[PDB]
């Protein structure tokens, strides 16, 4: 289900084969030309499409472009060398910009930025003021 | 001495049993030793002849080397000869490698690596006897070339015929 592309010297390298790799998938209603983050132009297929990239940002950048084409069914995965796959985005099925009941707060401090502790107070502690 | 020596060619009439008084077999691997024994021996066999051949039977028609003394000619000879000599030896060494990899043997094996005269016996009995003769002649030659050199530098060290000098 690979989109039609002729190849580039800006594709993935060894890290994709020995450390980690990424993959995005989407469905289209027409064959159209899009610009790939790696560099160049490609033609998507009329239906399912799969593409591999080396960075999550590269994948999410393409998603932005896809939204312009009115495609909002994209999914991003991380494939480890052993074959293990992790579903990353949309994580809970709902885009992050939309509040979804069932999501808990993380890394939240209940005070204004100016209420953090003084650096000297936490000296020889190992923690930082913003983590204190 | 190493046990394998008991099952190898080399012991004969003048040496009924394994000769390794200092048990060098303990240190040097048995295989490497035989390979080296033959290599140094075969080369020595050729040297002995070369030590006197130019003197006794004459020299080629050239003036690069004027002396006949075996040692002196080494420096008189043009360097180009020496370079080509190293090259030919390298070629020989390569041949032994490639042919050995083809299953052939240059150490008394079943399939000869170099038998241009086609005189390698088929029967194992004769083969064994043939190998023994080569080893002997080789050992004798090594001793001889050493002797020649000795008398050359330290006169009287060895009983060498005058012509051989």
């Amino acid at each position: 289900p690979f989109p039609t592309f002729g190849g580039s010297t800006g594709g993935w390298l060894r890290a994709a084969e020995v450390e980690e790799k990424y993959a995005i998938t989407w469905t289209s209603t027409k064959e159209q030309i899009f610009e790939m983050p790696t560099g160049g132009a490609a033609i998507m297929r009329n239906g399912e499409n799969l593409l591999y990239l080396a960075r999550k940002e590269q994948c999410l950048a393409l998603s932005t472009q896809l939204r312009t084409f009115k495609i909002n069914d994209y999914k991003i995965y991380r494939i480890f060398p052993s074959g293990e796959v992790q579903y990353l985005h949309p994580k809970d099925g709902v885009f992050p910009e939309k509040v979804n009941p069932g999501r808990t707060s993380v890394n939240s401090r209940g005070f204004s930025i100016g209420k953090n502790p003084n650096p000297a107070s936490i000296k020889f502690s190992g923690i930082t003021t913003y983590e204190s | 001495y190493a046990s394998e020596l008991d099952s190898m060619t080399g012991t004969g009439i003048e040496s009924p049993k394994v000769f390794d008084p200092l048990n060098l077999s303990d240190y040097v691997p048995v295989d490497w030793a035989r390979r080296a024994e033959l290599s140094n021996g075969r080369s020595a066999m050729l040297a002995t002849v070369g030590w006197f051949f130019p003197k006794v039977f004459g020299t080629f028609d050239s003036t690069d080397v004027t002396t006949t003394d075996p040692i002196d000619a080494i420096m008189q000879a043009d360097p180009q000869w020496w370079a080509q000599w190293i090259l030919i030896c390298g070629v020989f060494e390569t041949w032994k490698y490639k042919k050995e990899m083809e299953g052939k043997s240059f150490l008394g094996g079943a399939d000869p690596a170099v038998d241009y005269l086609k005189l390698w016996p088929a029967d194992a009995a004769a083969q064994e006897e043939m190998k023994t003769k080569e080893l002997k002649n080789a050992r004798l030659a090594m001793i001889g070339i050493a002797g020649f050199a000795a008398n050359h530098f330290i006169p009287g060290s060895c009983p060498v015929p005058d012509f051989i000098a």
């Binding site: - | 051949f53 039977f57 004459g58 080629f60 028609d61 086609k118 088929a122």
Partner: protein
């Protein structure tokens, strides 16, 4: 038909290099093979002879004769006739062994054959191939020499004559 199996094939791919399709059947091939061998053997001796003479060596009683084709033209025919007589006799003597490769004269009166030289079949094939190949080379060689002799007088192209190193012969 397929003479690739025959000794002397150019190589595994080309098989028998017969550009003009002289050979058609085994019968013809045998004819051609016999001829090639004969010419080859004759040539091998010829090159040896030409070189020996051109370089200067002469038999007792032949110290004033010239060398090369010039000899054939100048030397007395009477002293050349012996060659024909000694060759014609051989022509009659050599006897081809039936059911054997062309050029096998094992059936000759005097003992002739692989004798002690060859043991295995492979050894025989090798010696045979070498005889043929060396003959092929000489055939070209003797021509090359004669031609150049006529062209410039230098039968060896790069040097006038050979110098031999025969220690024992001295």
């Amino acid at each position: 038909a397929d003479f690739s199996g025959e000794i002397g094939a150019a190589n595994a791919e080309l098989g028998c290099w017969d550009p003009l399709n002289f050979c058609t059947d085994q019968a013809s091939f045998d004819k051609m093979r016999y001829a090639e061998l004969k010419h080859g053997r004759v040539a091998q001796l010829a090159a040896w002879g030409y070189a020996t003479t051109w370089s200067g060596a002469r038999f007792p009683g032949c110290e004033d004769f010239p060398a090369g084709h010039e000899a054939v033209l100048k030397i007395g025919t009477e002293n050349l006739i012996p060659v024909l007589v000694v060759a014609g006799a051989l022509e009659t003597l050599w006897k081809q062994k039936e059911g054997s490769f062309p050029g096998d004269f094992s059936a000759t009166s005097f003992p002739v054959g692989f004798g002690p030289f060859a043991k295995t079949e492979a050894d025989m094939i090798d010696l045979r191939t070498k005889e043929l190949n060396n003959g092929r080379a000489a055939m070209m060689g003797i021509l090359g020499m004669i031609v150049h002799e006529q062209i410039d007088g230098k039968p060896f192209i790069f040097f006038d004559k050979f110098e031999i190193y025969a220690p024992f012969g001295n």
